[PDB]
Design a protein around this ligand. Sequence first.
Ligand SMILES: [Mn+2]
Ligand SMILES: [Mn+2]
Lengths: 206, 206
Amino acid sequence: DPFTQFKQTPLPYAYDALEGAIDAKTMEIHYSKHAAGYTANLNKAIAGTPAEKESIENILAKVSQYSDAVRNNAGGHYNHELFWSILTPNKGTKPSAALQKAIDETFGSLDALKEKINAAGAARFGSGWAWLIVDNGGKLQVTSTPNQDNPLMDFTKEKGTPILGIDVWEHAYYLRYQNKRADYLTTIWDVINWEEVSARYEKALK
Amino acid sequence: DPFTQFKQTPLPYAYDALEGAIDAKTMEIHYSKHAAGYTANLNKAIAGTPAEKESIENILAKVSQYSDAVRNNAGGHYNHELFWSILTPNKGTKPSAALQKAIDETFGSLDALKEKINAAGAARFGSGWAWLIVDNGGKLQVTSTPNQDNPLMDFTKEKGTPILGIDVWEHAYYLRYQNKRADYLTTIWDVINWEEVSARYEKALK
Ligand SMILES: [Mn+2]
Ligand SMILES: [Mn+2]
């Protein structure tokens, strides 16, 4: 149906494409059950409200005006859409010159950034997300959020434009890693698409 | 070491005893990794604090006064301890007469209570627990809480003594049920120990 307000973007690789870090069964369920549900429930939650014809970014920026169903599903739809875009089967991507310079000046090195994101992801108690965001004015920051909340939402304390998000809900890693969230975090770097992260950085700075 | 403040209680059944409903691998990881970690981290978090020699119920009743590490791990330890006790491989347990009468007057029947708990468990967005409690007026209530929070904590909205708790963190059901939380909740009734729930109800009323 072309007329639904929000749609999932088709995955740009096969479910088994990310097997260097994420099992195929998880990819299938995570995309076709969890993420699909957020999209469908978002379209239902906004129907008949002032969010009905708003962009996802505008819904998130005003999300406290709306129901909890709008918050949770707007978050879930945005977050998962971003997540698929920042994964790739193509090994060896790296930050753009501009992003690498910013990472090095702000954290010291790519390894230092990864360590900070790993720690943020590990420290998120319960369900949530780890993020790299660009704050207003352009500074990179690492944060985490609960459940499907994100850095675009009006009440989130550390606000900014996400350029990388990593899902630390247990559904994202339990089939392959069970309790070992730290091993998921260490391994997922092998499938992070730094070209997409860099494109999002470029767009955030405009 | 007998002198640690908190210890795990061994299970009253084998890891594989609940296979009608919960896989052996989940039982083992859930007990020996997740729950063991809450107990160990609780002991560390209270050390050198005013919680150090308090009973678990007294730590919970003042939990707003302590660190997140105390809150999250005191809840986690309590909740899991209770959980293992309310599971059994012995089929066909039933509520005591006193508990059955209260269930029937409050909910209508045992099926109606199960439906209410199943709905509370499904509606808990993110990680958490569904509960049957005896409130401060001696009445039964069904609730849910986020993360490792529970009805003994001073900041929980619906306070009371838990007599039954069901874990709806994804680690509790993902290996067998994946996204189908509702199927886990339907099935777990097959291994609920209503004799222990009834014992906890009798104690709460005293
Ligand atoms: Mn997810
Ligand atoms: Mn658990």
